[PDB]
Amino acid sequence: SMKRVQPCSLDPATQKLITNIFSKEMFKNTMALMDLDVKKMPLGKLSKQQIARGFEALEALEEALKDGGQSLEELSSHFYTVIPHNFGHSQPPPINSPELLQAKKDMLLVLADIELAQALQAVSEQEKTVEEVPHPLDRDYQLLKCQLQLLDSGAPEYKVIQTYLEQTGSNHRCPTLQHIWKVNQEGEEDRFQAHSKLGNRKLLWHGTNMAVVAAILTSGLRIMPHSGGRVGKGIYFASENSKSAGYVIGMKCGAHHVGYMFLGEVALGREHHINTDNPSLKSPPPGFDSVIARGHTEPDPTQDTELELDGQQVVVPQGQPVPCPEFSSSTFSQSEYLIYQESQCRLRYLLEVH
Numbered sequence: 041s042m043k044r045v046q047p048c049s050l051d052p053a054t055q056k057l058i059t060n061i062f063s064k065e066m067f068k069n070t071m072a073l074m075d076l077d078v079k080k081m082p083l084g085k086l087s088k089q090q091i092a093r094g095f096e097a098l099e100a101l102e103e104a105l106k107d108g109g110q111s112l113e114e115l116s117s118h119f120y121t122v123i124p125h126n127f128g129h130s131q132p133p134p135i136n137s138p139e140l141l142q143a144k145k146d147m148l149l150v151l152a153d154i155e156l157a158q159a160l161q162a163v164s165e166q167e168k169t170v171e172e173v174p175h176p177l178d179r180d181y182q183l184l185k186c187q188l189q190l191l192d193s194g195a196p197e198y199k200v201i202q203t204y205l206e207q208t209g210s211n212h213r214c215p216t217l218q219h220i221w222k223v224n225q226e227g228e229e230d231r232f233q234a235h236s237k238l239g240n241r242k243l244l245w246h247g248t249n250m251a252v253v254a255a256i257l258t259s260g261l262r263i264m265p266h267s268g269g270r271v272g273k274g275i276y277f278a279s280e281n282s283k284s285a286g287y288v289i290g291m292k293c294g295a296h297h298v299g300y301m302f303l304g305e306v307a308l309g310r311e312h313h314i315n316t317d318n319p320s321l322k323s324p325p326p327g328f329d330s331v332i333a334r335g336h337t338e339p340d341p342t343q344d345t346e347l348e349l350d351g352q353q354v355v356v357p358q359g360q361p362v363p364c365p366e367f368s369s370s371t372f373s374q375s376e377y378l379i380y381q382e383s384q385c386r387l388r389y390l391l392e393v394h
């Protein structure tokens with residue numbers, strides 16, 4: 041007997057978001073942008089076991105990069121058997137530098153989040169038996185177990201967020217704000233409330249691939265075993281929207297380029313400042329709660345405002361970037377804000393920008 045499809049409860053903007061973040065075209069586009077062979081590795085065929093085998097192959101490469109073992113070419117060839125790549129049907133290249141190794145780790149971390157979104161969409165047994173089903177976009181929203189509330193122009197934080205975006209975004213071609221959603225991923229709540237005594241909270245940008253937005257909404261910002269970067273194995277944020285915007289992978293839809301950016305509330309507590317890259321970091325030094333790789337510039341602190349979120353004061357920058365003379369010789373042009381415990385961040389807002 042034919043099941044009733046119930047009318048969609050979602051507003052137009054939210055329907056478009058949910059469409060975009062679970063879009064099979066988007067996911068395949070992302071795989072093509074990462075040089076993967078989508079014909080050999082279709083979305084439905086992606087598995088946790090394959091991804092795990094891919095990480096094992098990179099682990100062997102990393103050991104080799106650091107005695108009569110297999111060549112980097114041999115070890116590369118195994119990686120490429122496990123995770124099919126497309127380079128117009130020429131041979132893929134050997135993974136023979138730290139930079140390329142980390143780039144392959146980052147690719148697999150994105151691919152793991154694509155696989156998460158596919159696994160999330162698997163049809164449950166209850167769903168095969170019920171005689172009515174939600175509209176597919178309601179079903180997809182529900183799978184996130186994440187409350188999203190579209191804000192309008194006159195929500196209390198709206199202008200504050202717009203100002204953060206405009207003032208710290210690129211001077212030329214600032215991203216154009218289309219929508220803001222408030223994000224409430226419950227049971228981020230419990231673990232976040234752990235740091236309730238920890239002051240020094242700031243609202244910070246986190247930009248990402250469109251392909252990982254569903255995973256983040258479902259699971260929060262995460263630190264994975266193979267996460268890395270210029271400040272080690274943590275969660276990376278920026279106070280300058282233009283820095284985070286560099287990591288936004290958007291997608292052409294009609295005549296525009298659509299992308300998504302988060303704002304997280306980050307309990308930074310006692311800050312350890314650095315001025316040179318350190319990819320080996322796994323925690324702040326003792327008695328520090330965060331590591332800030334300080335940039336040549338910082339949003340003018342004299343213009344900071346505050347928002348009250350769950351009864352706590354949260355700093356929100358509102359100023360254009362100004363020079364910080366103490367960090368004029370830093371290896372970082374713009375600051376990178378690092379935490380090394382997932383519990384120190386709560387997602388607060390999601391922005392659609394064109």
Ligand SMILES: C[C@@H](NC(=O)CCc1nc2ccccc2c(=O)[nH]1)c1ccccn1
Binds near residue numbers: 150
């Ligand atoms: C590959 C990793 N993505 C990021 O951390 C990407 C974006 C990011 N990097 C920054 C670095 C410095 C300052 C800001 C940012 C940021 O906003 N985004 C990732 C993707 C999926 C699952 C787990 N980790």
